[PDB]
Structure formats: C-alpha cells, structure tokens
C-alpha cells in the first residue's frame, strides 16, 4: 500500500548539480528503513548510492565520494537525492526504495526517472503519421504507426486512443542519431475497426513540455 | 569489495520448464546471526526491479512459490519452477551483507516457443514529412520468434545500406515474440528521385525473403 515516486529534471549539464525528489505516500518515513536511491546505467548496470534512515542516519557508496548528500522532509514526507558535479557517466535511471534492514523491498520501488548529462539542447519531437500505402485485407489486421522524431533528451511516451488501445502495440528503442532520437511506435488493430473508428496517438516529452496527439488517416 | 558474479544462461527455456541461475560471492554473506544477507530480483522488460527473494531463501509478500532461493554462503542458486510467459526478463542478485550493497550483472531469462515468421509491415513517408524536407519509410517485423533476423532494403531494385537505423524490442511477456523496426532515412529530393521501395525480412521460418513494397 505503500508508493515511491522519484521527480526531478532529466537534463542536467557537465559539472553541475543532479538533484531528485522521492515522494513516498502510505508510510511515514521517519521510520526504520532504509530509504535508498539506486540507480541503473544505460546497458543496465545496477548501483546502490546511498539511503537515509530513522531520519538522521545517512550512509553512501564510497564511489561517489563527497558527491552525494541524502537528505528528508519529514513535512511533505519526501526524500532527496543530491549529486554534485555532475558528468555523462551519471547518465542514467534513478530509483527510489524502500529496503527493510534485512533487504527486503518488495516491489517499493518508485518508477524511475531518466536523467541525462549532456551540454546539447532540449529538443521536441515532430510526430508523424504512419498510414498504409494502399488498401490491405479487410476482415484481417492492420497495422498503423507513428514515427517520433528528433527529440533530446530521452524520454517520450507513447500511447494509442490515450491508453484506450493498449493490447498490440509495440514501441520500439530510441535510436539516437546527431545528439537526436527518433523512435517509431506501431499499433495493430482490426481491419473492420480502421478506418471506421478513429486510430489517433499520443505522444508525450516532459522536458520540452510537448504533448501531441497525431490522427492516423487513410492517404 | 566483495565481488558478485552472476552466469550466463547458454538456453532459452519453454514454458512449463523450470531453470536454476546462479550467484557467486568472493565472501560469505552469512552474518553473526546465522542469516544469510542474499537478495534476488526480477527486472521485467520496461519495468522496475522488483524482489523475489531477500535472506538468500525467503520470498517477499506476493511472491509466487513457484521462486525458490537457496545456497551456502557464497554461492547461490535461483530455481524458477515451472516457468511462464511473464518470467522473461533479467534476474540479478544482490549481496546485502556490507557496502556497497552490491547487485550481481543480471542473467537473462528468454523463453523458447515455436517458430512464428514476422509480420511486415511498410509505410511511406508521410505527407506532413515531406513538407518538412524529410523522407522516411519505416517498416515494421512484428511478432517473430526466434529474435535473429536480416533486414534488407531496395530501391528500385537496388540495395540500400546507408541511412538505415534498426531498433529491436526485449522478448513479449505475453506472447514470447520479438520485434523490430526498420527505418530509411532520406532527403525529400533523394525520395522524390525513386519509384520502388522494399522492405525485406530474412527469417528462419522462410526460405525467401518476406518482402513488402511500394510505388512512390
């Protein structure tokens, strides 16, 4: 019953400060766990960085060196990632989670947040419609996509009819090209219900605040 | 530090099978307190890490049965029993014993299921593209198992190697299939110049390529 979430900006440039929240709702945690961050390298390499516990007692990965402080306000029950310095091998996702003093999370563990290092510029995506050529079987499947393009940083999200169309899609991985993204997303729906029920997707960059929805129609 | 080691696994594995992975540590991982400080994790494609098992033996609330952790102090086994669909993914141990708590390399579950062809799919570049001075043609390979393919393209019967970027999905926790998209990248004007545009999957499951096309 308990939830983590970590937020936070997903730029940050050379040399300057990472900072990230954990918002923890369904428990205290002026409490006798470990609230730690972790976080995951682009290739998938797991670190432990350090945890606040019993509110006062913090301890760090020696790696980080006087990098990093850990700390918590007990008012809006949330605790704080701070890493100074910063470089592109800081790149990576990061993790809140709550591990009991004989390792045990559960799944407490927040969502993730990508953080990237990097002097380029907030880029947004232009979205593109994926529509079949010609006409293709009926009474069959069709698939549909969209293609997003030219955005920095990572991440977009993608969804079909908000969420609706949630079964058959496949979202591919970024392919970064120029200090820019592009990735494709294709949806397969029934031949009967397209083009005769609308097939529209969105998508989402937090970081250049973008939020585009992109109908896809018979050309 | 103590150092982690986790191996690979040299087979895919069907459903209904069950697997043992394995852990090592240079150090023991059994405290004064006769408990053994040994986590295992299941990281689902997409997802967070989520823990089966902490005290190298003792499954965390919700966890299926079907994961069972056992070991000495220094190595340690994983048993998944009677494997389904959405154990795919990457298991990593974690020592849990001293700093820096460290995690073990993963080891990567994929499941073994029947052949299936991909199915492709092509697309032009789209209108609102081409206004921008751009020209994309993407294609789809859906839901084809096993994961290794060739994608081959042609314009105007000739090959195309330059300004093709790939991308390729983690195994299905559904279906057990993989996918992949392909897609040519050209000028407005280099698209304009052509007529013919084919996308070719080379897969086990057919002896000719599996081709779609289009005329500009």
């Known amino acids: 019953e308990v939830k983590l979430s970590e937020s936070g900006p997903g730029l940050v440039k050379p040399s300057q400060s990472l900072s990230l929240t954990c918002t923890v709702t369904?428990?205290?945690?002026?409490?006798?766990?470990?609230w730690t961050w972790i976080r995951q390298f682009p290739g998938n390499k797991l670190e432990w960085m350090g945890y606040?516990?019993?509110?006062?007692?913090?301890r760090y990965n020696p790696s980080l060196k006087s990098r990093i402080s850990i700390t918590q306000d007990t008012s809006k029950n949330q605790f704080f990632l701070q890493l100074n310095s910063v470089t592109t091998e800081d790149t990576a996702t990061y993790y809140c989670?709550?591990?009991?003093?004989?390792?045990?999370?559960?799944?407490?563990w927040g969502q993730g947040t990508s953080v990237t290092v990097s002097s380029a510029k907030t880029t947004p995506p232009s979205v593109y419609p994926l529509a079949p050529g010609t006409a293709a079987l009926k009474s069959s499947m069709v698939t549909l996509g969209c293609l997003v393009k030219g955005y920095f940083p990572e991440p977009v999200t993608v969804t079909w009819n908000s969420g609706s169309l949630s079964s058959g899609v496949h979202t591919f991985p970024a392919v970064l090209q120029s200090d820019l993204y592009t990735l494709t997303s294709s949806v397969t729906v029934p031949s009967s219900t397209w083009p005769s029920q609308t097939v529209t997707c969105n998508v989402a960059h937090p970081a250049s605040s973008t939020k585009v929805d992109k109908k896809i129609v018979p050309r | 530090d103590i150092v982690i080691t986790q191996d690979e696994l040299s087979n895919p594995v069907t459903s209904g099978e069950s697997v043992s992975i394995s852990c090592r540590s240079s150090?023991?991982?059994?405290?004064?307190?006769?408990?053994?400080?040994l986590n295992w994790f299941l990281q689902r494609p997409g997802q967070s890490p989520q823990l089966l098992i902490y005290?190298?033996?003792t499954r965390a609330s919700g966890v299926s049965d079907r994961f069972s952790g056992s070991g000495s102090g220094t190595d340690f086994t994983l048993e998944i029993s009677r494997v389904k669909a959405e154990d795919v993914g990457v298991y990593y141990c974690?020592?849990?014993?001293?700093?820096?708590?460290?995690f073990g390399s993963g080891t990567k579950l994929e499941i073994k299921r029947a052949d299936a062809a991909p199915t492709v799919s092509i697309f032009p570049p789209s209108s609102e593209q081409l206004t921008s001075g751009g020209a994309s043609v993407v294609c789809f390979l859906n839901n084809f198992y096993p994961k290794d393919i060739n994608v081959k393209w042609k314009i105007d019967g000739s090959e195309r190697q330059n300004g093709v970027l790939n991308s390729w999905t983690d195994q299905d926790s559904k279906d057990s299939t993989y996918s992949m998209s392909s897609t040519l990248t050209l000028t407005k004007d280099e698209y304009e110049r052509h007529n013919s545009y084919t996308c070719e999957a080379t897969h086990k499951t057919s002896t000719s390529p599996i081709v779609k096309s289009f005329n500009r």
């Open positions: 989670a709550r591990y009991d003093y004989y390792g045990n999370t559960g799944d407490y």
């Open positions: 369904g428990y205290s945690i002026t409490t006798n766990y470990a």
């Open positions: 606040i516990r019993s509110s006062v007692i913090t």
């Open positions: 150090r023991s991982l059994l405290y004064k307190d006769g408990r053994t400080y």
């Open positions: 005290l190298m033996s």
């Open positions: 974690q020592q849990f014993v001293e700093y820096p708590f460290t």
